[PDB]
Symmetry: D2
Subunit: 466 residues, 4 copies
Amino acid sequence: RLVSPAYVRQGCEARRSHEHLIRLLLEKGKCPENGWDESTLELFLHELAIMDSNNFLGNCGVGEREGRVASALVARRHYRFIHGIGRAVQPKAAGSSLLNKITNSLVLDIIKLAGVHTVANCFVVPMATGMSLTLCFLTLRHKRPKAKYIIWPRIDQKSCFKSMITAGFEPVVIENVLEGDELRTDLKAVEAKVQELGPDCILCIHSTTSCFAPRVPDRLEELAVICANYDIPHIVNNAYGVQSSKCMHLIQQGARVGRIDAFVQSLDKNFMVPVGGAIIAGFNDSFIQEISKMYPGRASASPSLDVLITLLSLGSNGYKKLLKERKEMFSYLSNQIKKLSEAYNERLLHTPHNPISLAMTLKTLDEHRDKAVTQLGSMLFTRQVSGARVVPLGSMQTVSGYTFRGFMSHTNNYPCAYLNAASAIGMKMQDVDLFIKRLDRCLKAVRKERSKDVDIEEMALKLDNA
Amino acid sequence: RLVSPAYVRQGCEARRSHEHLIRLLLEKGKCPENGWDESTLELFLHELAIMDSNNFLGNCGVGEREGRVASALVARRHYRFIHGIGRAVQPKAAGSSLLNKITNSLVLDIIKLAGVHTVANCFVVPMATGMSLTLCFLTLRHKRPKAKYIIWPRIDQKSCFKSMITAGFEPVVIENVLEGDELRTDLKAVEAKVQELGPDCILCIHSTTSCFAPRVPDRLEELAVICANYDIPHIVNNAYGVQSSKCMHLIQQGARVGRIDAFVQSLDKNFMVPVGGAIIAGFNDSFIQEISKMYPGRASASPSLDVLITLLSLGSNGYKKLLKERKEMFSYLSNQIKKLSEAYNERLLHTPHNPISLAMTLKTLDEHRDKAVTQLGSMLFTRQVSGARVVPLGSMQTVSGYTFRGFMSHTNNYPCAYLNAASAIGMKMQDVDLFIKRLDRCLKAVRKERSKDVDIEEMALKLDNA
Amino acid sequence: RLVSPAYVRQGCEARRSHEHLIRLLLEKGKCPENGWDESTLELFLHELAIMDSNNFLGNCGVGEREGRVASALVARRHYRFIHGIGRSGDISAVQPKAAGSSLLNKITNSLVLDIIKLAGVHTVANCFVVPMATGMSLTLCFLTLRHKRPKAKYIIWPRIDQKSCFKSMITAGFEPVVIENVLEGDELRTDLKAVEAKVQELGPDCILCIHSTTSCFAPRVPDRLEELAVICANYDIPHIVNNAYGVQSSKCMHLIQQGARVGRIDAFVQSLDKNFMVPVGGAIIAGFNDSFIQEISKMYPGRASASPSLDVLITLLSLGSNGYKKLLKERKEMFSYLSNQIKKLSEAYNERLLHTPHNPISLAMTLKTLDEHRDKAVTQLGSMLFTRQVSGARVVPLGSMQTVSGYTFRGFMSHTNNYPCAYLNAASAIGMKMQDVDLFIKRLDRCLKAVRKERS
Amino acid sequence: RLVSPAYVRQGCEARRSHEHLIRLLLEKGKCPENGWDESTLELFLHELAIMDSNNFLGNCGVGEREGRVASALVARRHYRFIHGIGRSGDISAVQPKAAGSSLLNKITNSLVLDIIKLAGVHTVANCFVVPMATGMSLTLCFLTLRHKRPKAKYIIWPRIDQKSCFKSMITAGFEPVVIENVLEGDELRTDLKAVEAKVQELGPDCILCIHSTTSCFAPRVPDRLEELAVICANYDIPHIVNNAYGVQSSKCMHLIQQGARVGRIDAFVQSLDKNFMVPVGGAIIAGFNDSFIQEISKMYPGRASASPSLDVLITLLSLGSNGYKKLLKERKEMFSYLSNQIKKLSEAYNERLLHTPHNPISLAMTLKTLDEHRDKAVTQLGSMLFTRQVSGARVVPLGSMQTVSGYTFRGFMSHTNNYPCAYLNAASAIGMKMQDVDLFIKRLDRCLKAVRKERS
RNA sequence: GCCCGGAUGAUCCUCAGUGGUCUGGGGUGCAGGCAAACCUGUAGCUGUCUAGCGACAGAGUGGUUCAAUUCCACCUUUCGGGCGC
RNA sequence: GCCCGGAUGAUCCUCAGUGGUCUGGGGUGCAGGCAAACCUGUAGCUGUCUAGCGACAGAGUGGUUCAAUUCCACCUUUCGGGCGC
Ligand SMILES: *Cc1c(COP(=O)(O)O)cnc(C)c1O
Ligand SMILES: *Cc1c(COP(=O)(O)O)cnc(C)c1O
């Protein structure tokens, strides 16, 4: 095996083309335009992992947190990143620390590409959006120690509602105003509540962009002006709004004319990675760092690793293509539901200000007698349609002591029951066509039961009977 | 490929021996005594993953959280568990939900095996110990709304200290009492502070078991009696105490004679998995469930998956063997440091009540002139010794506004500077021998510089010069 | 935990849809039309591997071949298939020690037979994967024929300049009889009269077989299999076809099918890697006489690697027959695009595309305007394309001499002693993308510019 | 990000310790004494694979063998080594299209040569891995000898009842001359006078080689290689040694070394899976004449699979020479334990351990007290052990007849026509654990109890 | 290896009985009463903590019941019966 | 493919100049003044939002500087020079 020096030359020159892509990533911190090949990616990950002390060849550990791993399956599935992330001259996990920095720089680049070009700082946190919102509220407590209220335009979603209560504050629920079919921000009620309670007693205004139709993204510009005038922090729930240029442009415009202290988005919903992580972003770099420093102890590196792999494999061109296809799939889904609803004397709710979610009416379904609105949601489930959300009339729900009327509808008395469908990133035409086909069959069976492909149906009938 | 019915028979009978181990796990929820083979484990994981809707063959998704995965590397490294964990007749992630239940049952079994036999309930949370302690304090706020103080016997560790402040409470630092070389709980000062502030103003007493020598685990029994008498919650930081039968028995005895509302432990420190997760356990089942319900939104399944793989691969016998070896390695490390310290006129601090961590004095090192105590920590680092913690005299440190004197030493004026080493799970004899060998060389070079194996040293001298 | 009857039910319902696909594969042995999801595939492979005795839970081994694996990396990368395929006396016999590997082998051979029919040879009777490449697989065919024709010494072989298929005859222990090709236009084609003359000179009983070739580099074209098959049928001489990468060509496959219809074809051999985009190491031996194909299989001594069979099994189940058909359709489309791009580029440099309509895979462009005795440009062009990361382009100079196993070829790489000119080869093989052609055209354009500049 | 000069420095310092191990391997080609960590190994493999042209970033392919991979599962499980080993005319020649695979092949063969010396044949001159099992590898040896001895028709072969090594001679196209063994005590040993008599009867020029066997089932023992090597040297006859699983036996290896010292051994062949705990599919051909071993390698037509070479490379780098030595030492210890346990069990059932001290791997226990014409207990015992998940135990009955490739064996599996009794085989092969023997003893004890109960 | 029928686990040993705090038939050791005999009393193991003495707990895992050595399911061991490339 | 030397990116087109808000030498279109001519003025692209008009932003990515078309590093493109299983 005595190798020729040309072999060592060829072996060195072969690695240079890969190192060049790695050096460009490290120098400018931007997503590659075209995605890396898997070989470049895994070479990069292996070279980062060996920088952590637990992967040193001559390492000995006499501490209680040495990154020892009992299972080889566990070590390999994490690419030997064991020490997690957190934060100088004696780094125990220099590779994980570099992984954290690059990942945050890549996500910041995507956030600018997605529409918030003036974002100043962001970081990945391995908690989902709800806990990440809680961490924002926990940071604001020390800044506004006399504050106990969070003003919150109503959106029926348990995680973002619980985030305020888990943080130890009292939500002030601002009901929405019905304009046509849409539920929109009641700016008059928001400002009246600010004056009633007093700006010093308000921890922040907690607004939401991405949401289920017929709710639309909040009027962020007007809310940001209210927050700037009364010196009240503004925290935006942007859980799955990164994928929507409409939502991102609302955030940029809100920060331009007024105040947005932070906006939070889910990793899984915007980057097609496992549930578990989120991004906290903002326009004041010092404040965003303050939220980061509020986190006690080290944290999992697994969500950062997931989105690092994803963005390097997709590239900015790959992510742009997903954003374009999401818009095209939204138009296709909208046209298909419009065509289907006509056959059953239903209609697509008129919600032009919601760019992600759509709703079809269910007025022809008798829920009081036949409970067909509830039956529809079950039948769609047994036919393996996921994400189709059915909203009946008059649902009463208690969440952490607060009682919601008309729950899931974001208002006390919406005119009708309806069904939700959304065009989120990664959806294919097959998703739309199968959903339309199965929804058609479910509506037929509901109507047929009042007058008096195959294997999904055979198991559906058995589950429906059980 | 027309197969014989005997082939289908053989193929069915072959899987039965594996399914038998799986059924026993699901029926009784106990760790297997002997570890599963990898084939049984991966068959089990694959059968769980296909129960999640994102892995259904005929699934169509029209929602915003469908578990879509852009990168095949990401999907495979998580065994196709994408939906995370959280919490009925329409489960979107029935496989992940079963994974969560089994993992919590396995961890509960290990906690009983480790020494807390009367534990009633526990759950894995994908946050490290600091954030998990915060979640405990956040849960207690609603129970004791007039409380603002957390009484806390001092331990110099930034994560557990920050946990109280991030939760929005004011730590009341109780200084420790020096008994011989050991720093122990000042029970008189704890109770005097309870009476001074008033029990209703105390959110909880926050005690600690696992800690660096010369601090020892807190007097949990006496603290639990104080908590029971004054009706004050008791939260125990047991970050890496699961591996110590001494620590676990303190927790069981504390709950027997008094009150322990919850104890928290790190996943990585006690189970040799990546940093990122923790276990919250307790003796009141309803209260432990209350902490669980306080968490907003879904959470990462990756820490649960790691410890599930680990415990199924190790078995209870494998974990018991690691616990036994940790005790043997503690005696060996203690005897080796005792022998080395004699050669340099130092000594092993007398800390018999700390079963994990040890400390060797550094009295012969001149830190005021030569800064040799600080130099020692650097030299050990450059020689690739990790976890060796050097504690100089007179370190002043501010953490979230609070100023610590004598930081890292858990007291304002400890008699001497010292060096920490620990026998944690997974440590091998090689770790001890290499640490002893390199510490010997570092002490020689420090003393030699006052009078006036090879490649680790060559790089160490270069880093030491830089 | 508390596995309610719901979890037991849901776990069975979830496995049903995957097992439906598996059962359809086992009952009919056909390639799935649409490819399987990875989850179905890895579930299938895991359930196959657990059938092998080395993966049994309560197993104890007291033998010398227990399938023990020292490295976990080795075991996992092979999906725990350790025992190989076959038994000591037959690579097709079922191994009770390795029932899962035996099932893997049977399914794989059935999928491959299905593809061969889909690819164009609908009358194929039997085939099997062998974990040797095409040259060594041709040798196995010749080794099988020896006992049937004990007086045979020669193999009649229309010339094709490829060392492996030439050495296959010599390694088998026979003497190649090289039949020179006929220049018909720009194409090199079978000299049928010279083939029949050698049959009459040497004697049919002295000839082990006629060894013809379909897939080849332009300007050579597939052999005239129909006329060769008639010669073989008339003289009772076996006919072995080297079809190394002809599975991807419906024209090559139809030519094999037609030769078997009008005359005699005893076996045809094809490469796994060239036709199924898997690593090098395996081949397929196929034929129309079921018993004779089984004879070749039984000639193989001992067990053999399962790795090539596992690769094609994974590939075909993931692609599906629709996926493979799509790759075949795209190969034709890329052939037309590559040909048009070469024609366009050849105009700009006063060259031309050689007219080889009977070769559906390989193309040839003249290099007559390049001087090699003056500049050595023809020889340099090959290494210039290589340094610019163009792979697969053959530069064929004039008058190259090459000795292979004692036999001297004149005009090597050109399949004849004096082809009129030097030329460049490019091919449209399965898996090729439009970017492959565009980069090749751009980089070849830069190579020719540099040679002209270096002369001027 | 902000890769400070610290991160660039730390990244280079971290890679240094791993590259030190790699450079030590490349400069000397020796097995590391202590095994590599997985991180070092996978870093090495990844840097090798990126040297292959199919893994280049700016590559375009216009050929028919570009190493395209349709399935990502296939590409990853092979660490992106797609091109196989060798070239069209030589499996040892460097492939400029696959420089990484060529380097993998050279390193692997060097590691294997190092182990062969460590295992006991210190005078070995050359060896190479071939991705065929032992039987097919023996065939390649015989195929190489044909051109050197064109009049040769026969292979003289001391009988061993194993179908692969017997078929290897026939597949190569030669006639086996079966030499019956001599009963010496309980052992079956080489009949040297019958071997020399066949040499004189048939004529040395008519004999292709003498084909001897080391590793074998008791009561057969390794052949008398020293006396056979002298016979071959005196008559100028090649000597090919079947050493299928003898690498793990220092006594087998020393016997090969001594035969080469006093006489002639042209090549010895061993299985990869039986000696290195890797999947079935590869073998090692080794010898003492460097040029002749290279001749066998050059006889192989075409490229070949890299998968067996990758498996042994991973295994040997992970084990280290210390790891392999430890497995060899444990095999001897397990042999003594298995033998003592069999002796103890054989006492309880009025049986005995056959005295076969010259076989260091395989053991044989009598089954004379079992009646087969009355109860068919001997035949049933085999399937009884199988149903209790005992693998590798050979039950050898009396008077079994078996036809292999037209040749009829009498007393098959027993290596002689009339061995005095039926017996049971068990072996201590590398990787065996104490649990293997204890489970075997317990389950065999239960089988014998059931047979006696069924009779009574 | 699996299916099926039993027994089996951890209160000195055994053998019976018993849903009610266990029982009594033989023994063994220790200890006393009056050398077999014989009467009366007594009894072991594991983990953790502790310098110790001792202290906290365990009776295969769970279930039912006010109450389980007793009844139920599973597991461990073992005895049966059956299946035998 | 790589190393090296330049130029190059996104204000009508070009060609020069310029660290100072750009310049002027030729042209083109549009628009007026007095058919070549000729004078004066004017100018494009992308993303997002919007029924629209329009509105918010972008000049390759960053750096230096009070200030960058100008200077620096890298990237894109391209022209050179060199390297050729
Ligand atoms: C293993 C073995 C062989 C070779 O068998 P293959 O399946 O070809 O590898 C030959 N002879 C003996 C004695 C063997 O044990
Ligand atoms: C591929 C090929 C062969 C076989 O080459 P191997 O390396 O043995 O697979 C034979 N003839 C031709 C024309 C080929 O293209």
